[PDB]
DNA sequence: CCGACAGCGCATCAGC
DNA sequence: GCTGATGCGC
DNA sequence: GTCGG
């Protein structure tokens, strides 16, 4: 938040290029820049001083410029006046619907929450469930919360199979004291790199939970990764919680480390660490950290026994994750 | 200038 | 039904 | 939109 003004300025921008220009790479722009410059220890004082950081280059400069001296940008204040922008940005908020379904309402006078209700029969499952607990899904959850979650989780997939392992990552795992979801990621004996011993293994945690009614609707579900929604039990008389998306992704076993750094997160963190490795000859997955030939073709897998260990193979000093949240 | 921009699971569609 | 592309999400 | 080469 020190230079909060121009980090909300840079992802309000990423989202237009995102969500209305359908320009993926102009998104990642801004949204680089923004993590970037939300790091600065330092109190920006013109674009000049921020183009010295990477990421940010001449355009950006100019609209941090005309931030600092007027106190806002009108390529945001004219975005903001546009009807179909305004919308299409909205309909994207509710999870299920992109850039494109979105822009695909709004062609049919369909932009506002009140007509989605009205007009839920044109929606897909997905879009279904979100627009159901949009309200819910825009809240954060607090780490108390949170908390509380892993235990009936770690708890119920332990009643299931001891040998499941259940860690909850996401920004819940970097320190966060809010997250916007809970993460969590699987592994068992039986589902390794080499063979799944046993079928049903997402399934019956799914399952499990659904049966105590935590897990309350389900967005998506494959033999490995599981979206959802989920809520906690309150108390007689208690107010109900509010309902919270929940992603479940089971992982091969042996590849936990390589696992666990992903879902660790954050997106741009990742992003970085991949592009970086790539630029060291390497190549980072969920699942591995392969070499890359001299024709670039993906090796076979480095061995790995710690989060450590991949940092090392891209020589880069080990970040904790409360340090990972870029 | 110019190609790269991280990598992949699930739902859904088109074409067969 | 499949494969492969696309949309959307992690 | 920004970057390395
Ligand atoms: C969205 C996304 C996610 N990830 C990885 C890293 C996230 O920590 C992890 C969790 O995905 P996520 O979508 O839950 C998240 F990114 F929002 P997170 O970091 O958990 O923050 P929060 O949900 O707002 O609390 O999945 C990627 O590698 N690429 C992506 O584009
Ligand atoms: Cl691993
Ligand atoms: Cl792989
Ligand atoms: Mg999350
Ligand atoms: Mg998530
Ligand atoms: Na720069
Ligand atoms: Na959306």
């Known amino acids: 938040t020190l230079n909060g003004g121009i980090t909300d300025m840079l992802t309000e921008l990423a989202n237009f290029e995102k969500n209305v220009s359908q320009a993926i790479h102009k998104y990642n722009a801004y949204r680089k820049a923004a993590s970037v410059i939300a790091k600065y220890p330092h109190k920006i004082k013109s674009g000049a001083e921020a183009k010295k950081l990477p990421g940010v280059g001449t355009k950006i400069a100019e609209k941090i410029d005309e931030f ?12 903001r006046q546009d009807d179909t922008s305004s919308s299409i940005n909205f309909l994207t ?9 979105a822009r695909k309402f709004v062609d049919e006078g369909i932009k506002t929450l009140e007509d989605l209700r009205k007009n839920e029969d044109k929606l897909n499952h997905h879009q279904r469930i979100g627009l159901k607990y949009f309200g819910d899904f825009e809240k954060r959850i607090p780490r108390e919360e949170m908390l509380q979650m892993q235990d009936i989780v770690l708890n119920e997939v332990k009643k299931v199979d001891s040998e499941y392992i259940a860690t909850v990552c996401g ?15 699987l592994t068992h004996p039986s589902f390794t790199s080499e063979s799944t011993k046993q079928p049903k293994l997402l399934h019956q945690v799914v399952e499990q939970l659904q049966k ?34 929940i992603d479940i992704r089971l992982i091969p076993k042996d590849q936990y480390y390589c696992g666990v750094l992903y879902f660790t997160g954050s997106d741009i963190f990742n992003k970085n660490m991949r592009a970086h490795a ?8 969920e699942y591995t950290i392969r070499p890359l030939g001299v024709t670039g073709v993906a090796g076979e897998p480095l061995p790995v026994d710690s ?13 904790e994750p409360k340090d990972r949240s870029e």
Request: contains cysteine.
């Open 171 to 185: 920004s819940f795992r970097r320190g966060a004291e809010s997250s916007g979801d809970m993460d969590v990621l």
């Open 307 to 319: 989060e450590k260990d991949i940092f090392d193979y891209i020589q880069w000093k080990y970040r």
């Open 278 to 285: 790539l630029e060291k000859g390497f190549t980072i997955n």
């Open 93 to 101: 908020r509710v999870s299920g619907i992109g850039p494109s379904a």
């Open 212 to 245: 105590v009614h935590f897990i309350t609707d389900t967005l998506s579900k494959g033999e490995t990764k599981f979206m959802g929604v989920c809520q906690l039990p309150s108390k007689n008389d208690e107010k109900e919680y509010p309902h919270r998306r």
């Open 68 to 79: 600092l001296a007027t106190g806002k940008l009108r390529k945001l204040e004219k975005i």
